Amino acid sequence: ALNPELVQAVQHVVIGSSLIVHFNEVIGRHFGCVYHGTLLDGKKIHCAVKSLNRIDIGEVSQFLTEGIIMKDFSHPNVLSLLGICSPLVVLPYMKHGDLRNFIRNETHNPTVKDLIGFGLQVAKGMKYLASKKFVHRDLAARNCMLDEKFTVKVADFGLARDMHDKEYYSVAKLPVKWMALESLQTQKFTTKSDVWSFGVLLWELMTRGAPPYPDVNTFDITVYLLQGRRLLQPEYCPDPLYEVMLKCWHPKAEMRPSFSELVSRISAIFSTFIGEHYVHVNAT
Ligand SMILES: CCN1CCC(CCNC(=O)Nc2nc3ccc(Sc4nnc5ccc(-c6cccs6)nn45)cc3s2)CC1
Numbered sequence: 235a236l237n238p239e240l241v242q243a244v245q246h247v248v249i250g251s252s253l254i255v256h257f258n259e260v261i262g263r264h265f266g267c268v269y270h271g272t273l274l275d276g277k278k279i280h281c282a283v284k285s286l287n288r289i290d291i292g293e294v295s296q297f298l299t300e301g302i303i304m305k306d307f308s309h310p311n312v313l314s315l316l317g318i319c320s321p322l323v324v325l326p327y328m329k330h331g332d333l334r335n336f337i338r339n340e341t342h343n344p345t346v347k348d349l350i351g352f353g354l355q356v357a358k359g360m361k362y363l364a365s366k367k368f369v370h371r372d373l374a375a376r377n378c379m380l381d382e383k384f385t386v387k388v389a390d391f392g393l394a395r396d397m398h399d400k401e402y403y404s405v406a407k408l409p410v411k412w413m414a415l416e417s418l419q420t421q422k423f424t425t426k427s428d429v430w431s432f433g434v435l436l437w438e439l440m441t442r443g444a445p446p447y448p449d450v451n452t453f454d455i456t457v458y459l460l461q462g463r464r465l466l467q468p469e470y471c472p473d474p475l476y477e478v479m480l481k482c483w484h485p486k487a488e489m490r491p492s493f494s495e496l497v498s499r500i501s502a503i504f505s506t507f508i509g510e511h512y513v514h515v516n517a518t
């Protein structure tokens with residue numbers, strides 16, 4: 235029943251090696267549910283297996299097409315797809331989980347250098363996605379993960395794209411407090427609106443995961459911004475990094491820096507720090 239050209243094209247994505255899905259070990263549950271897993275080939279690889287609903291032959295066609303597209307994306311700062319198989323999406327397990335919880339954790343002691351380092355890795359992952367004409371639409375610290383080497387990987391990508399939390403989404407995903415001014419008015423997204431979201435992600439990093447605009451309700455953000463306001467400078471945010479955030483929030487989308495310019499500018503700032511400045515959480 236399926237297009238035979240598509241069946242041959244998806245073969246390099248489909249996994250036979252073999253996979254052991256640990257169905258009793260759940261991660262999260264919107265859309266489908268994520269479980270722990272183990273891959274093969276004479277080695278055991280810890281993975282996160284997402285099982286999507288019960289999806290018609292056209293739905294199966296999209297699933298196989300998405301798998302090929304996803305597999306064509308490879309970058310150390312972008313969460314990879316290991317393969318596909320109910321439809322199974324197999325992703326590498328990220329030991330330290332999401333970036334927002336990692337920095338919020340009071341037992342963690344990040345320095346200014348470490349936090350800027352995480353922002354730099356996110357910028358590199360986004361620089362890769364933009365070059366592939368991929369518009370993320372939901373870049374936030376909650377949507378970035380950390381592996382065992384503390385490598386940051388931009389997630390919430392392709393078949394894994396979901397809504398895991400609700401308080402950050404106005405009820406198509408609308409992460410209002412991370413959205414560019416023009417996206418709040420048109421509901422359209424570009425690489426330049428991902429640049430706005432990246433400026434917000436840098437603010438999340440420097441405040442160790444504080445919610446942005448805490449005293450502003452989701453529905454009020456566009457009026458708040460149009461009065462001539464931006465997120466205030468975090469206490470442990472260096473002046474050149476705050477200048478970078480302000481550039482990410484330029485009212486004119488085309489005047490915002492590209493992710494390539496961000497990688498470059500942030501690499502310079504990052505290089506000036508030695509890991510002697512401990513970042514503490516704000517009381518407010
Ligand atoms: C002591 C406190 N603390 C310290 C360690 C901590 C982390 C454990 N490590 C993991 O949880 N790793 C993990 N890797 C992966 C790899 C892929 C996927 S699918 C996916 N694609 N994009 C996103 C974006 C968001 C989400 C989710 C949000 C809520 C539930 S899923 N899923 N998602 C999920 C996980 S979850 C647990 C306890």
Ligand SMILES: [Cl-]
Pocket residue numbers: 345346347348507508509510511512
């Ligand atoms: Cl430092």
